[PDB]
Amino acid sequence: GIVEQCCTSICSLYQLENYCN
Amino acid sequence: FVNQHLCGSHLVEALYLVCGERGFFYTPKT
Ligand SMILES: [Cl-]
Ligand SMILES: [Zn+2]
């Protein structure tokens, strides 16, 4: 999930947009 | 865009800004 990807590691803007609706 | 570990409410606010009117889903469930 997002925690592992953006909290634990670092996320680009493009990886953040995968969690938009 | 910032290049940093976004956690807690900092990750949620980020999602709000980036998703806009689209809205988003926040499911921390590992
Ligand atoms: Cl903090
Ligand atoms: Zn803080």
Nearest CA in chain B to A2: B28
Structural domain including B7 reads 1-30
CB contact under 8 A, B4 and A10: yes
Data resolution in angstroms: 1.6
The number of folded domains in chain B is 1
Q: To the nearest whole angstrom, how far is the Cα of B12 from the nearest Cα of chain A?
A: 10
Q: Rounded to 10 degrees, what is the CA torsion of B18, B19, B25, B26?
A: 20
What single-letter DSSP state applies at residue B4?
Answer: S
Which long-range contacts does B2-8 make (Cβ < 8 Å, 24+ apart)?
A: B3/A10, B3/A12, B4/A10, B5/A6, B5/A7, B5/A8, B5/A9, B5/A10, B6/A6, B6/A7, B6/A11, B6/A16, B7/A3, B7/A6, B7/A7, B8/A7
Nearest CA in chain A to B9: A7
Q: How much helix, strand and coil, in percent to the nearest 5, is found in chain B?
A: 50, 5, 45
Experimental method: X-ray
Q: Residue B24: beta bridge partners?
A: A20
Residues 6 or more apart in contact with residue A2 via CB below 8 angstroms:
A19, B11, B26, B27, B28
- Most A CBs within 10 Å: which of B6, B16, B26, as the mutation test of the A interface? B6
